[PDB]
């Protein structure tokens, strides 16, 4: 399915996302999955409060993701 391949193609670029938690994470993406797992670096979190933090490495569960936000050149990619 194409909605997963687009993700794999944004590996390397910087990504923004939203979780069921309520917070948004922003950073370079290293690995993804068909599940929608993620592996990122130099993340800059921002919760409901506005509280910023730093997280060196992160793994996720896709189930917990609401939606992603992806770079602009990834609209000319082949489907």
């Amino acid at each position: 399915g194409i909605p997963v391949k687009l993700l794999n193609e944004a590996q390397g670029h910087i990504v923004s996302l939203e979780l069921t938690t309520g917070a948004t994470y922003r950073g370079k993406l290293v690995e993804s999955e068909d599940s929608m797992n993620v592996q990122l670096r130099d993340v800059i979190a921002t919760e409901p409060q506005g509280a910023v933090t730093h997280m060196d490495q992160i793994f996720v569960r896709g189930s917990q993701i609401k939606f992603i936000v992806v770079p602009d050149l990834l609209k000319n990619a082949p489907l």
């Binding site: 194409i2 391949k5 794999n8 193609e9 590996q11 390397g12 670029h13 990619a77 082949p78």
Partner: protein, 843 residues
């Protein structure tokens, strides 16, 4: 700027993925990749890159109607006139290509097409220091011969990942006409024989490290591929991944179930044969033999393909290709294994550490790059580089250095040049580039002037970062030149132009050694006949227009001995006594092999910087070496090992420790030359038996004194040592038919050494692989003799490996034996002849 790009895009025959998304993918380091392609003669390299390019560009201007039907194989990445007229790849040329995959996630890839000829092995090394992983292409008919052995060996030594591509299977079925059961056994024999020489990793079609392709008919296979596009539709998806495992390896399925049992019941074939080989042979026999009306039904029924009657009218061959490229689509199976086989973290640190030394600091935050090849394109000359760190842009001032100046290790240390333009290599075209990103191999204009052969390139803003950075070691070429020719210009007034051209040669040709003598004659050292023939054509045509005179093919020799010393200073306060010893063959072979001593391998002497307890531990451990001598080992040479043995070493160790550097410079100076022919010395050990120094030494011991005295003592020490003259020997790889074996034998008997090392039945083909050894002075016109005498059946490759120098049977100095002039000398004295002949050139 923008305008120049507007004229340059019109030359480029555009693309299906255009340039924007591929140029966009360059930022992420884990994205893209770099890959070289290597193999023997005519393995399908350049035609495989042909496949990737025709899957790349939508409209190529060069196609005749003939190449599109594929009667004559199209050659992309052979640009030059020599490459087309000769018929073989000469200079390496790459293609920057965005490739999708089965995962639909595309990546940029930098392909490097290396020549397959042995005389050009040097440039393959230039692709080794560049590529991250390498595709070794094997002929299913030829199988693997010694050159593949030494390719997977050099490959695994240089810390690059290996993909194996078994090519020309259509030559397996069509030419040799093997049944399925025998063809599977043949591929399996090739796989076992490629696995035998690899240590620590076993391959198998199941592990996706082996790829079955035919570049002519233009198809490519991995088992995951041919399973995914077809058998994945038919049966559920959870069973396919374990089905792939249940494909290879003796598994047999009777009806709907598989049992490893021998073949019990009746109708019996293996799974790989049943699901792959048999349907392939069916594709061929049906495409050729069957009525074209019948085939449409099998295409629609099985593969869901429909064809126009125009496709049904070609000829047997171009219709076969149209059917194969039709059924098996654009090749993402190759890109799958190329994507999987290279993981940057595990290999990369070992690969960069193998050159820049393992110590690393100042990560990222610096421009760090390595210049390998000076390429001749339509304009001028261009610099092929790999980008290890940092960002390049047009007009950037860049620091440059040379590999030898790096061997030597503030102000006066920095030559610098601006980067005028950076292209991506498009083979026949070049793509203009604003900015160069980490990991990608790019072309640059303006950097060539500061270097010859390899170069180290960096930009550093910090002092500590200047201190921590470590330069690239000089690129180790795969073969030593060894093939000697004396050029003069036909009209001496034209000497300067030739000079210029020669320098240009040394730039574009990494394996050439240009030496200027006393008389102005220009000695050129090159790998073989063909290589130096390309040298001479580019020298008379492209570069220098001067008509030139060429001498008779010759070779470089060496000096040795087989077993006391009195010496006197020009101001007789010094005395030198140095013994001369032959060396063990095991020690010689361990020195000639360049290694870090990893595993159980004997340590190379270049690691002497490690604790001499370790070096002495290696010497004593392997050779039973003398403990005192092992600890008294001083250094190695440009050449053999140097040791200090005497009591005054104990008497005045410090006074000698002041002269050690004098001895070590004047010594390299001495053995770099020689007493007989002024040629380097091979396999000769020295020990310093005595040293006598002036009294109170008032500026008395000096380099101008000790150095030429040590030099003379080494020379006459070699004279009293019963010296010998040394000749290099090619190892010969011949492929002939069985009934032609005696002829080859006589050929060997006719030349000089007549030494055949091995004779090997080539399994599955009517070919003999004959390994042998030939003197290089006799190697002239040997290939043509073999080819003519055998009426076009068979072939010869002369490769220089193990770098062995065999003794010349002639007496070393005997004025008595030599025979009249213009007569080839007798077998009894060939040493006196060669020595004298070089002597009257030296003076």
């Amino acid at each position: 700027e923008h305008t120049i790009f507007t004229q340059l895009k019109k030359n480029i025959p555009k693309t299906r993925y255009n340039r924007d998304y591929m140029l966009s993918m360059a930022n992420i380091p884990e994205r893209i990749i770099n890959v070289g392609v290597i193999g023997p003669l005519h393995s399908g390299k350049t035609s495989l890159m042909d496949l990737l390019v025709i899957d790349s560009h939508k409209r190529i201007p060069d196609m005749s109607k003939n190449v599109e039907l594929g009667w004559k194989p199209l050659r992309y990445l052979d640009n030059l006139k020599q490459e087309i007229d000769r018929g073989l790849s000469i200079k390496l040329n790459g293609s920057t290509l965005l490739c999708t995959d089965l995962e639909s996630k595309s990546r940029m890839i930098n392909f490097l097409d290396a020549p397959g000829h042995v005389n050009f092995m040097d440039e393959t090394a230039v692709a080794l220091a560049a590529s991250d992983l390498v595709l070794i292409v094997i002929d299913v008919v030829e199988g693997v011969t010694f050159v593949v052995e030494q390719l997977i060996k050099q490959s695994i030594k240089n810390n690059v990942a290996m993909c194996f591509v078994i090519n020309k299977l259509d030559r397996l079925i069509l030419d040799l006409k093997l049944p399925p059961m025998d063809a599977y056994l043949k591929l399996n024999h090739i796989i076992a024989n490629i696995n035998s020489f690899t240590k620590g990793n076993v391959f198998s079609p199941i592990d996706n490290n082996i790829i079955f392709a035919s570049t002519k008919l233009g198809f490519t296979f991995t088992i995951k591929e041919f399973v995914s596009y077809y058998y994945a539709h038919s049966i559920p998806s959870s069973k396919i991944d374990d089905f792939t495992t249940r494909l290879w390896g003796s598994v047999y399925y009777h009806k709907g179930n598989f049992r490893t049992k021998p073949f019990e019941n009746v109708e019996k074939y293996p799974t790989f044969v049943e699901f792959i080989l048999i349907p392939l042979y069916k594709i061929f026999s049906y495409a050729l033999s069957m009525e074209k009306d019948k085939l449409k039904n099998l295409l629609r029924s099985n593969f869901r393909v429909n064809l126009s009657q125009e496709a049904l009218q070609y000829d047997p061959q171009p219709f076969l290709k149209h059917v194969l490229q039709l059924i098996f689509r654009q090749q993402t199976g190759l890109v799958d294994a190329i994507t999987r086989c290279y993981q940057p973290f595990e290999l990369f640190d070992n690969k960069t550490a193998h050159l820049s030394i393992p110590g690393k600091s100042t990560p990222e935050g610096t421009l760090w790059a390595h210049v390998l090849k000076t390429v001749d394109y339509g304009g001028a000359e261009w610099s092929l580089v790999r980008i290890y760190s940092g960002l390049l842009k047009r007009g950037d001032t860049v620091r440059i250095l040379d590999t030898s100046q790096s061997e030597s290790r503030e102000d006066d240390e920095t030559p610098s040049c601006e980067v005028e333009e950076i292209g991506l290599l498009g083979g026949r075209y070049v793509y203009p580039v604003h900015e160069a990103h980490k990991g990608q191999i790019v072309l640059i204009k303006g950097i060539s002037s500061a270097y010859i052969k390899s170069a180290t390139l960096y930009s550093v803003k910090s002092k500590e970062d200047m201190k921590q950075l470590k330069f690239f070691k000089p690129l180790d070429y795969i073969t030593e030149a060894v093939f000697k020719i004396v050029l003069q210009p036909l009209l001496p007034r034209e000497l300067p132009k030739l000079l210029d051209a020669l320098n240009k040669i040394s730039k574009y040709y990494p394996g050439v050694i240009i030496k200027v003598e006393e008389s102005g004659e220009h000695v050129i050292l090159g790998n073989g006949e063909l290589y130096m023939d390309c040298l001479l054509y580019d020298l008379r045509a492209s570069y220098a227009k001067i008509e030139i005179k060429i001498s008779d093919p010759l070779t470089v020799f060496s000096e040795s001995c087989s077993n006391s010393r009195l010496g006197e200073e020009n101001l007789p306060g010094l005395s030198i006594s140095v013994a001369a010893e032959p060396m063990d063959s095991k020690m010689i072979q361990d020195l000639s092999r360049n290694t870090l001593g990893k595993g159980q391998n004997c340590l190379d002497i270049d690691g002497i910087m490690d604790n001499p307890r370790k070096l002495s531990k290696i010497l004593r451990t392997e050779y039973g070496w003398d403990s005192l001598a092992s600890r008294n080992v001083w250094s190695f040479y440009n050449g053999n090992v140097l040791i200090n043995d005497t009591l005054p070493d104990e008497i005045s160790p410090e006074l000698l420790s002041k002269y050690k550097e004098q001895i070590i410079q004047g010594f390299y100076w001495a053995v770099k030359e020689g007493p007989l022919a002024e040629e380097p010395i091979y396999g000769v050990q020295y020990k310093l038996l005595s040293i006598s120094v002036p009294s109170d030494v008032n500026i008395d011991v000096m380099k101008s004194q000790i150095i030429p005295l040590m030099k003379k003592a080494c020379y006459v020490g070699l004279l009293t040592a019963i010296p010998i003259l040394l000749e290099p020997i090619y190892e010969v790889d011949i492929t002939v038919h069985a009934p032609l074996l005696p002829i080859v034998e006589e050929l060997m008997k006719k030349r000089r050494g007549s030494r055949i090392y091995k004779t090997i039945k080539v399994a599955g083909t009517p070919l003999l692989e004959v390994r042998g050894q030939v003197p290089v002075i006799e190697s002239a016109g040997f290939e043509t003799d073999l080819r003519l005498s055998t009426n076009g059946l068979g072939m010869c490759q002369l490769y220089f490996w193990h770098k062995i120098w065999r003794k010349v049977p002639g007496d070393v100095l005997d004025k008595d034996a030599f025979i009249p002039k213009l007569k080839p000398a007798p077998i009894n004295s060939l040493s006196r002849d060669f020595v004298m002949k070089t002597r009257r050139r030296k003076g």
